[PDB]
């Protein structure tokens, strides 16, 4: 009934290059993260991961699976099923699906079986297809303002109960059976080898791994930049996921001369695919972050750094003023370079194995 | 919470020609049969089945798996595991194991998935290796007077509870985890796709299949044979399994002249491998039947017809007197032929598909 440690990996794929884009992963990952954080889990929550990235993530999660620890692996995205095998489809995989570009569940399972963990939860919320392993395999992605998936809708309600994981997983499967969409088709399949009364609400009693997590989720301190013209800018930061950071720009001081100005953030490194057409927005929802206008200050300009695991070099970006007073007809610009270092998951380079 | 019908198939392999003989199947099958009979299940309980027999049994069980019925399939014997596949080993299979001679679990499963049954329980007690399918896969055969297997030891206690099958299967897995032999190794693995509150204790509310079961388990009426010398013999019958019948011979009348006699049963058809060295025993335990001396009359001679599914032709056997009085020095014999018809499972010929 006790855990040596509690570590979880959460993968959500929402933006496919060559397959249909998915809406549910973002909320399910965010919501399940904070819920496991409540259960004292050192969670890594990653969005829109490629083949090589996914592979590196899992291997790194598997390394933490020492004797008596509690592992949780949640994947929400596209799935594939060929010759009784199932695969987790990454964002880079081309259409049609091919196994060489995907992650075989059966293999992940084979590696998990070679473990001495007191509990290991393998959750899959797939679309369009003793180690004490508790395998939960859902097949429904037909999901307020924001979309929550059918599996998570029920998983969240029961996740905080002090009952055996298999008992909750069985109740969530029946809960789905009461719902109209999930009664028609049997989306949930459970596979257990759990010999003891192990729950997700179980205390821990080696805390060096807690310090390694803190190091992996360090957000840059709020910075202020003074410009030649006099205007002083505020640079704020917020964490959304392990690989997703929101950047905000506000104006602290404006002299009576300046009638219109706003600091824009640009020239982010090439490795992260951020298109200027989706940055420096009016509200943070426009990006769009799970983070709502209320938890971030109003009158700012927002930019979301979606892919941080691609940060090979220290974060360097330029900020522009774009200030014009009605007296003069032409718009003027002044710019300066900022170094934010290696934020969040970017600290540990995703490269390589 | 209701069943269209409740049908179960129980296979136990206890006497291997080319692999180690097993002791537990006999009690587990007998004990689980009567327990499911209590739960209003039309059970067929078969012992020591070959390749072709096993294959025919399963197919015939699968044909009963119509919409909303409750199926239960219990196999206790040797198992085999090659390339992630598991196999049920029949009695005729040679050593080493070969798949062509065995029954792939994965295939049985594939066929079960093509069903509309309200519940389908697949139990396996293997050694030395929506359809609402509840797959229970045990791997421990290191089992009063008679041996009861580790899985059954706990399965029987919980089998009569009005709780969801998956909940009981989870409790039996934990019960095993409390036991010393079953805590060391994780023998039980559960796989469920059960979306609704379906239990083995569930009422039925099409009863033509009940009449077909009765027909399949008709035992021959107790017969008496009068001999030329005067001595009258009693021929009794008892059912042990669907394919296993106990035959008993007693003496009703003996004139004052006869000082020693006993009716021996012989010349049973060749298809059933009964060796005279194991027939006409002092007590029924000597055969040995699960049936104890107390439920059958004392002072009889017992013969067990182990394999009845091999009965292609009406049961014909000869009975001999073997009577000698101390006055005369030589032992005399008189014999007559008896037709018992097609008893128990022998009524429906196991041949062929
Ligand atoms: C601490 S709590 C925690 C829980 C889940 C993950 C995780 C950390 N990390 C950091 C893993 C460390 C980093 C240092 C070397 C050894 N590894 C195993 C990951 C990192 C990269 C991809 C996926 C994951 S999964
Ligand atoms: C009635 S209740 C019941 C429960 C489990 C079995 C069973 C009957 N029978 C008789 C099956 C009938 C006989 C007539 C034709 C259609 N079939 C499907 C078997 C017979 C032979 C091998 C295994 C089995 S399994």
- Rounded to whole angstroms, the Cα distance separating A294 from A297 reads 7
- Rounded to whole angstroms, the Cα distance separating A1 from B114 reads 39
- Rounded to whole angstroms, the Cα distance separating A122 from B76 reads 30
Residue of B293, B14, B303, B31 whose CA lies nearest to B159: B31
Active site residues of A: 78, 127
Q: Decide if A124 contacts A81 (C-beta within 8 A).
A: no
B109–A contact, CB cutoff 8 A: no
Determine phi and psi for A68, rounding to 5 degrees: 65, 5
DSSP SS3 for A248: strand
Residue of A174, A171, A141, A184 whose CA lies nearest to B130: A184
Phi-psi label, residue B98: left if phi above 0, alpha if psi -120 to 50, beta otherwise: beta
The CA distance from A110 to the nearest CA of chain B, in Å, is: 10
Determine phi and psi for A259, rounding to 5 degrees: -90, -25
Chain breaks in chain A (C to N over 2.5 A) after: 129, 143, 205
Going from the C-alpha of A132 to that of each of A58, A198, A283, B164, the distances in angstroms are 18, 9, 45, 22
Q: Which of residues 128-147 of A touch B (CB under 8 A)?
A: 130, 132
Q: In chain A, which residues have their Cβ closer than 8 Å to the Cβ of B167?
A: 167, 170
* B173, closest residue in chain A (CA to CA): A195
- Contact A196/B188, CB-based, under 8 Å? no
Chain breaks in chain B (C to N over 2.5 A) after: 129, 143, 205
* Torsion angle of the four alpha carbons A82, A88, A91, A95, in this order, in degrees rounded to the nearest 10: 10
Residues across chain B: 353
- Rounded to whole angstroms, the Cα distance separating A340 from A317 reads 9
DSSP SS3 for A85: strand
Q: Number of C-alpha atoms within 13 angstroms, CB side, residue A157?
A: 12
A210 burial via Cβ count (<10 Å: 0-12, 13-18, 19+): middle
- Rounded to whole angstroms, the Cα distance separating B308 from A87 reads 48
Q: Decide if B147 contacts B136 (C-beta within 8 A).
A: no
Which architecture characterizes domain B214-353 according to CATH?
Sandwich (2.60)
- Rounded to whole angstroms, the Cα distance separating B67 from B62 reads 12
Question: Is there a catalytic annotation at residue B127?
Answer: yes
Question: What are the residues whose beta carbons fall under 8 Å from the beta carbon of B83, sequence distance 6 or more?
Answer: none
Task: Residue A81: count other Cβ atoms within 10 Å of its Cβ.
Answer: 14
Going from the C-alpha of B227 to that of each of A242, B174, B221, B222, B347, the distances in angstroms are 94, 61, 19, 17, 29
B254 burial via Cβ count (<10 Å: 0-12, 13-18, 19+): middle
- Rounded to whole angstroms, the Cα distance separating A40 from A53 reads 26
- How would you label B289-310 residue by residue, b for 16+ Cβ within 10 Å and e otherwise? bbbeeeebeeebbbbbbbbbbb
Catalytic residue chosen out of the listed positions B127, B140, B261, B300: B127
End-to-end Cα spacing for chain B:
34
- Contact B130/A186, CB-based, under 8 Å? yes
- Rounded to whole angstroms, the Cα distance separating A79 from A77 reads 7
Determine phi and psi for A233, rounding to 5 degrees: -105, 145
Q: Residue A223 C-alpha to ligand 1 middle, in angstroms?
A: 28
- Rounded to whole angstroms, the Cα distance separating B45 from B50 reads 15
* A172, closest residue in chain B (CA to CA): B195
- Rounded to whole angstroms, the Cα distance separating B75 from B54 reads 10
Domain coordinates of chain B in residue numbers? 1-213, 214-353
Question: Is there a catalytic annotation at residue B353?
Answer: no
- Contact B195/A189, CB-based, under 8 Å? no
Q: In chain A, which residues have their Cβ closer than 8 Å to the Cβ of B196?
A: 174, 177
Q: For residue B193, give the nearest of A167, A189, A197 by CB distance.
A: A189
- Rounded to whole angstroms, the Cα distance separating B179 from B167 reads 19
Q: Residue A73 C-alpha to ligand 2 middle, in angstroms?
A: 44
Going from the C-alpha of B345 to that of each of B147, B215, B338, B341, B351, the distances in angstroms are 26, 9, 19, 12, 12
- Rounded to whole angstroms, the Cα distance separating A143 from A182 reads 11
Q: Decide if B132 contacts B195 (C-beta within 8 A).
A: yes
Task: Residue A91: count other Cβ atoms within 10 Å of its Cβ.
Answer: 22
Instruction: Please name the method used to determine this structure.
Output: X-ray
Catalytic residue chosen out of the listed positions B78, B140, B261, B300: B78
Residue of A124, A143, A139, A55 whose CA lies nearest to A93: A55
Phi-psi label, residue B133: left if phi above 0, alpha if psi -120 to 50, beta otherwise: beta
- Contact B176/A191, CB-based, under 8 Å? no
CA angle B331, B335, B337 (to 5 degrees): 165
Going from the C-alpha of B285 to that of each of A165, A169, B12, B236, B292, the distances in angstroms are 46, 47, 19, 16, 6
Bridge partners of A237, per DSSP, are A247
- Rounded to whole angstroms, the Cα distance separating B130 from B115 reads 8
**Nominal resolution (angstroms):** 2.7
A15 burial via Cβ count (<10 Å: 0-12, 13-18, 19+): middle
Determine phi and psi for B164, rounding to 5 degrees: -55, 135
- Rounded to whole angstroms, the Cα distance separating A175 from A154 reads 7
Does the C-beta of B42 come closer than 6 Å to ligand 2?
yes
Q: What is the 3-state secondary structure of chain B?
A: CCECCEEEEEEECCCCCCCCCCCCHHHHHHHHHHHHHHCCCEEEEEECCCHHHHHHHHHHHHHHCCCCCEEEEEEEEEEEEECCEEEECCCCCCCCCCHHHCEEHHHHHHHHHCCCCCEEEEEEEEECCCCCEEEEEECCCCCCCCCCCHHHHHHHHHHCCCCCHHHHHHHHHHHHHHCHHHHHCCCCEEEECCCCCCCCCCCECCCHHHHHHHHCCCCCCCEEEECCCCCEEEEEEEEEECCEEEEEEEEEECCCCCCCCCCEEECCCCCCCCCHHHCCECCHHHCCCCCCHHHCCCCCEEEEECCCCCCCCCEEEEEECCECCCCCCCCECCEEEEEEECCHHHCCCCCCC
Residue of B83, B170, B51 whose CA lies nearest to A84: B83
Q: For residue B177, give the nearest of A167, A185, A196 by CB distance.
A: A196
Which architecture characterizes domain A1-213 according to CATH?
3-Layer(aba) Sandwich (3.40)
- Rounded to whole angstroms, the Cα distance separating A224 from B334 reads 117
The sign one gets for the Cα dihedral A91, A94, A99, A101 is negative
């Amino acid at each position: 009934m006790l855990a040596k440690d509690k570590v979880a990996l959460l993968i959500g794929n929402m933006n496919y290059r060559e397959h249909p884009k998915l809406k549910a992963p973002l909320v399910d990952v965010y919501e399940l993260t904070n819920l496991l954080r409540q259960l004292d889990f050192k969670v890594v929550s990653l969005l829109d991961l490629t083949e090589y990235e996914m592979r590196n993530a899992v291997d790194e999660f598997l390394l933490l699976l020492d004797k008596g620890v509690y592992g949780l692996l949640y994947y929400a995205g596209h799935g594939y099923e060929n010759f009784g095998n199932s695969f987790m489809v990454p964002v880079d995989a081309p259409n049609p699906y091919r196994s060489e570009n995907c992650l075989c569940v059966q293999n992940i399972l084979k590696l998990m079986q070679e473990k001495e963990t007191g509990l290991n939860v393998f959750l899959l919320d797939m679309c369009r297809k003793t180690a004490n392993i508790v395998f939960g395999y859902a097949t429904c992605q037909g999901a307020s303002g924001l979309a929550n998936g059918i599996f998570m809708k029920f998983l969240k309600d029961r996740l905080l109960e002090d009952k055996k994981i298999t008992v909750l997983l069985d109740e969530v499967a029946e809960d789905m059976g009461k719902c109209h969409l999930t009664k028609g088709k049997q989306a949930l399949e459970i596979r257990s080898s759990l010999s003891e009364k192990r729950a997700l609400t179980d205390p821990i009693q080696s805390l060096v791994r807690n310090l390694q997590w803190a190091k992996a989720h360090e957000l840059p301190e709020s910075m202020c930049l003074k410009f030649d013209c006099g205007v002083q800018i505020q640079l704020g930061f917020a964490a959304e996921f392990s690989n997703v950071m929101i950047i905000y720009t506000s104006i602290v001081y404006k002299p009576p001369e300046i009638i219109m100005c706003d600091a824009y953030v640009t020239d982010f490194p090439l490795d992260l695919d951020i298109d200027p057409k989706d940055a420096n927005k009016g509200t943070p929802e426009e990006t769009g972050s799970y983070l709502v206008s209320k938890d971030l200050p109003k009158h700012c300009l927002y930019t979301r750094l979606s892919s941080l695991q691609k940060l090979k070099e220290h974060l360097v970006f330029t900020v522009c003023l774009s200030y014009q007073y009605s007296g003069l007809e032409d718009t003027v610009e002044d710019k300066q370079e900022v170094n934010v270092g290696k934020p969040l998951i970017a600290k540990l380079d995703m490269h390589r194995h």
